[PDB]
Amino acid sequence: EFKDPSLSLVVPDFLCEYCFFISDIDFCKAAPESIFSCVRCHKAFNQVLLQEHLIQKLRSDIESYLIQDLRCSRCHKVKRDYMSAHCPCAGAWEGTLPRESIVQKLNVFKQVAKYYGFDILLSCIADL
Amino acid sequence: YRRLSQETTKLKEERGFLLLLQSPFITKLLGTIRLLNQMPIVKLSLNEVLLPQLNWQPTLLKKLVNHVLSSGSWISHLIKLSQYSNIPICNLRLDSMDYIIDVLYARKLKKENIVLWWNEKAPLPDHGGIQNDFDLNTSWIMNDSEFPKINNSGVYDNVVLDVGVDNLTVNTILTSEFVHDAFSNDALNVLRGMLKEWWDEALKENSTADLLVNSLASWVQNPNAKLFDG
Amino acid sequence: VKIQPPLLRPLAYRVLSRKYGLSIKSDGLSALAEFVGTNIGANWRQGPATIKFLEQFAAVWKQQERGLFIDQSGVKEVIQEMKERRDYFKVINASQQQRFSYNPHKMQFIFVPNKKQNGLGGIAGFLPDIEDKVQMFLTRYYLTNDRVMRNENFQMSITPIKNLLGRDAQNFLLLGLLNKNFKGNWSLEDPSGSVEIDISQTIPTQGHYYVPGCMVLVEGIYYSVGNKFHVTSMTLPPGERREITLETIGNLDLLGIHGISNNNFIARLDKDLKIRLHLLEKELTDHKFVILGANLFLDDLKIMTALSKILQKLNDDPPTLLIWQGSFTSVPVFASMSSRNISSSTQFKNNFDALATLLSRFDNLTENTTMIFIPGPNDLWGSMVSLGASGTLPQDPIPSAFTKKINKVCKNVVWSSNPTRIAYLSQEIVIFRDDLSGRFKRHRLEFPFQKVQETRKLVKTILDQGHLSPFLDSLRPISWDLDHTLTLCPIPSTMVLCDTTSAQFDLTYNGCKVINPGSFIHNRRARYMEYVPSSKKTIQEEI
Numbered sequence: 001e002f003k004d005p006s007l008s009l010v011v012p013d014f015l016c017e018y019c020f021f022i023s024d025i026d027f028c029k030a031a032p033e034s035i036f037s038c039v040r041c042h043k044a045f046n047q048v049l050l051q052e053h054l055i056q057k058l059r060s061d062i063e064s065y066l067i068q069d070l071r072c073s074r075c076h077k078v079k080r081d082y083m084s085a086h087c088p089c090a091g092a093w094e095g096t097l098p099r100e101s102i103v104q105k106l107n108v109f110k111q112v113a114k115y116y117g118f119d120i121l122l123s124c125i126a127d128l
Numbered sequence: 129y130r131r132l133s134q135e136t137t138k139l140k141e142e143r144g145f146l147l148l149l150q151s152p153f154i155t156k157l158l159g160t161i162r163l164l165n166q167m168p169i170v171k172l173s174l175n176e177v178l179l180p181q182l183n184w185q186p187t188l189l190k191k192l193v194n195h196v197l198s199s200g201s202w203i204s205h206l207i208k209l210s211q212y213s214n215i216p217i218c219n220l221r222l223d224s225m226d227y228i229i230d231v232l233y234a235r236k237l238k239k240e241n242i243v244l245w246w247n248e249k250a251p252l253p254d255h256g257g258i259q260n261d262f263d264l265n266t267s268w269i270m271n272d273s274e275f276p277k278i279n280n281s282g283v284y285d286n287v288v289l290d291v292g293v294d295n296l297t298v299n300t301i302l303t304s305e306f307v308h309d310a311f312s313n314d315a316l317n318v319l320r321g322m323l324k325e326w327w328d329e330a331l332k333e334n335s336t337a338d339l340l341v342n343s344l345a346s347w348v349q350n351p352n353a354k355l356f357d358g
Numbered sequence: 359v360k361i362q363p364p365l366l367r368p369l370a371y372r373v374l375s376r377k378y379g380l381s382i383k384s385d386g387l388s389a390l391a392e393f394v395g396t397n398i399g400a401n402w403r404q405g406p407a408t409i410k411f412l413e414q415f416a417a418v419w420k421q422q423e424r425g426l427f428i429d430q431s432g433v434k435e436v437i438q439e440m441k442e443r444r445d446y447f448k449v450i451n452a453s454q455q456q457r458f459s460y461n462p463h464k465m466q467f468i469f470v471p472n473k474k475q476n477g478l479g480g481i482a483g484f485l486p487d488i489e490d491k492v493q494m495f496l497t498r499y500y501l502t503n504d505r506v507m508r509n510e511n512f513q514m515s516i517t518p519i520k521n522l523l524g525r526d527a528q529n530f531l532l533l534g535l536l537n538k539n540f541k542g543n544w545s546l547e548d549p550s551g552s553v554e555i556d557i558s559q560t561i562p563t564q565g566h567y568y569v570p571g572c573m574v575l576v577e578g579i580y581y582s583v584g585n586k587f588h589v590t591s592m593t594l595p596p597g598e599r600r601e602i603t604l605e606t607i608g609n610l611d612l613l614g615i616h617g618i619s620n621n622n623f624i625a626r627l628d629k630d631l632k633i634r635l636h637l638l639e640k641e642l643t644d645h646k647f648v649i650l651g652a653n654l655f656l657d658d659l660k661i662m663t664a665l666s667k668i669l670q671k672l673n674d675d676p677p678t679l680l681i682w683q684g685s686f687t688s689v690p691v692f693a694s695m696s697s698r699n700i701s702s703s704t705q706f707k708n709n710f711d712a713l714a715t716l717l718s719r720f721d722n723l724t725e726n727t728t729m730i731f732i733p734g735p736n737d738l739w740g741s742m743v744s745l746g747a748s749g750t751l752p753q754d755p756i757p758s759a760f761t762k763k764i765n766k767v768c769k770n771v772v773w774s775s776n777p778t779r780i781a782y783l784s785q786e787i788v789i790f791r792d793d794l795s796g797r798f799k800r801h802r803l804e805f806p807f808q809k810v811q812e813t814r815k816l817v818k819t820i821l822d823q824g825h826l827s828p829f830l831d832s833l834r835p836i837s838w839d840l841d842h843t844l845t846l847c848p849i850p851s852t853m854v855l856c857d858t859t860s861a862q863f864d865l866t867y868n869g870c871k872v873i874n875p876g877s878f879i880h881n882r883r884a885r886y887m888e889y890v891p892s893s894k895k896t897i898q899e900e901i
């Protein structure tokens with residue numbers, strides 16, 4: 001059975017001051033000589049800005065996971081009590097954001113930071 | 129290393145002129161020499177200059193010569209921008225296009241009856257002090273920046289047209305109580321009229337208006353510019 | 359003299375297998391052999407000295423673990439013997455704080471294994487699991503209810519919310535989370551159920567900041583016409599002192615410096631407490647620690663000038679602990695959209711490189727005093743996403759990638775979290791940097807009906823509620839597992855309650871003393887405050 005041999009990590013709305021041009025950028029699927037340069041103009045990007053935006057994305061992901069809501073198992077109603085054992089009906093709460101998704105995202109951040117030379121992002125991970 | 133003060137003093141007592149300043153440490157150089165506060169100075173910060181560790185003489189010579197012989201064009205452009213934007217000479221920068229938009233929009237709102245919510249040294253709008261508090265709706269509306277896309281796989285034996293769309297944001301802006309996530313429609317209409325007159329002026333042979341309209345979207349995205357709102 | 363192991367084996371074996379001890383390994387025999395080699399002489403004819411040295415070995419080794427095996431460490435106990443023939447205080451952050459759960463039905467604190475020590479942690483081990491946010495409010499309610507029940511006055515009995523369904527026209531006493539329901543009315547939440555409240559005729563106990571999210575004792579009459587509990591009075595639960603709080607669990611080593619507890623067993627100690635108290639009673643004036651104001655900025659020249667003026671005064675007489683608190687950058691750091699000027703991260707790195715230069719001319723302070731740094735509201739990690747607004751409370755320390763010169767210039771620097779705990783010989787200190795006055799004033803709940811009283815109410819409320827952040831998840835999101843670090847249980851002796859919106863004060867109440875440092879700079883004056891561990895304060899300023 002065929003699968004996709006690569007994951008995806010996309011940074012939305014990266015701006016090129018030399019063009020005022022807005023587009024996304026895929027750090028995993030896009031080939032080199034295009035991550036470091038604008039699509040239209042062939043002007044090199046600044047690397048610390050890329051690394052800072054990656055750190056921003058990772059921190060926003062962590063905060064978004066930590067601020068998630070709880071959903072019941074059988075019925076998909078939202079938890080509306082600050083403290084309760086479980087749903088009035090049968091079923092236990094589960095989070096909207098699963099753990100495995102963010103674990104895999106952190107793994108792909110590790111892979112991306114290891115492929116290129118990104119010391120600041122490595123130190124960002126190491127502080128956790 | 130002490131001759132900078134001597135040169136500045138001799139220039140001060142030899143002529144009353146404007147000074148072009150270009151360095152990554154503008155504030156540090158302003159603080160090192162006390163005579164710099166006594167003259168009108170225009171700053172032209174183009175930082176992030178480095179050395180190739182070898183054969184630096186010709187590259188630095190090229191930098192200096194192009195700077196000195198393009199300062200005329202630079203000051204001509206600055207004069208054009210200042211005499212169009214009703215802003216003094218020393219308060220403008222070549223790349224600081226957002227500042228002009230901010231000041232003119234604030235002036236238009238001041239002639240109106242809407243509070244500016246102006247802010248300094250902080251990339252948040254002024255809401256009376258409430259903005260520093262964490263809130264769920266705000267934190268959700270800052271971080272939802274993903275743009276969806278459509279992809280339908282398959283093999284096509286028919287002809288396919290690859291087209292490109294440009295100036296979508298400006299068209300979206302120009303074209304088109306109960307809801308709490310709504311932005312004040314008064315400001316939206318004000319900026320729509322502003323952009324309409326901007327477009328009309330840029331049509332009638334105005335490079336400055338065209339460049340400013342081009343930079344409008346980058347101003348909208350960038351939170352570093354003042355008068356920003358998520 | 360190089361010995362033969364066979365002719366030494368019985369001497370060790372008898373003493374360490376028949377009278378006391380057991381299970382001597384081969385490395386233990388080698389360590390004892392080299393010990394005999396050091397204390398060589400008229401041995402194999404000398405009785406008392408060797409056996410009493412073995413008894414001293416037992417008196418050194420029986421306290422460690424259980425002492426039923428002797429590995430390569432035999433040289434380590436030998437060195438312990440050699441060296442047995444200020445210190446004793448530690449500073450701990452919220453990340454490494456020991457984890458202790460709570461159980462209501464047995465009424466004991468329960469140790470929980472640390473995920474850092476037993477788990478792998480190679481990729482992601484800091485992420486709490488789902489049920490922690492379910493159990494955090496349960497734990498807070500359990501602790502509050504136990505504290506209320508232990509009170510002398512309450513031996514009247516409170517009733518659960520759910521048991522209010524069938525009766526009416528009767529008065530009751532209850533307590534629970536006072537908050538807003540989905541509809542928009544004020545309600546009380548209990549592990550059993552919830553009801554609607556009435557405020558139109560409520561007479562409060564003055565001196566308390568009634569904010570949503572704080573446990574409150576409610577008295578009133580239930581009515582079954584609707585679901586309205588007509589309240590007649592509201593009062594925060596009272597407090598308790600450190601000694602009575604401790605004695606219920608003996609003297610637990612929660613902030614254990616002498617010893618630690620684990621899943622296998624629980625520990626206790628009170629014999630050394632009076633020894634350490636008497637040790638503290640002498641040479642305490644020499645062991646002084648000084649703290650400064652908040653929001654000290656490393657970008658403007660005036661703050662650097664004031665800091666230089668302070669350091670030239672402090673160099674001659676270096677204190678023990680110097681605590682730097684507040685935000686070190688006046689502008690929050692975030693994504694930079696300009697590649698023409700200096701990036702925010704590079705500027706943040708540059709702000710600390712100047713401090714390394716300024717510390718080069720104060721070698722006495724650098725050599726004799728340790729440094730403590732505490733993050734503020736808009737440091738690198740927080741303002742990265744919150745953009746200078748309030749956010750998660752257990753803040754990470756200053757990243758190591760931006761302090762690569764301070765650790766080499768100074769021999770003792772420590773970066774801690776926003777809530778940090780230091781354990782002296784007989785003192786424990788908590789430092790908490792954030793704003794409270796505005797937070798309580800703006801969200802104060804209204805009741806239909808000279809600056810020293812505001813801080814009085816603040817202290818009374820924060821000590822009665824017994825939690826650092828008496829707010830719901832909507833206002834201040836909290837990490838799911840680290841909430842135990844914010845719990846105000848076995849309350850500390852002294853609180854460094856730094857606040858930029860409250861005047862400086864030195865209040866003490868209910869066995870706890872609270873100090874409120876202000877901003878480092880104010881009305882063209884610079885102020886920093888030093889606290890003597892003998893319950894004496896001093897305030898000094900330099901223009």
Ligand SMILES: [Zn+2]
Pocket residue numbers: 016017018019021038039040041042043
């Ligand atoms: Zn470009």
Ligand SMILES: [Zn+2]
Pocket residue numbers: 072073074075076087088089090091
């Ligand atoms: Zn259900």
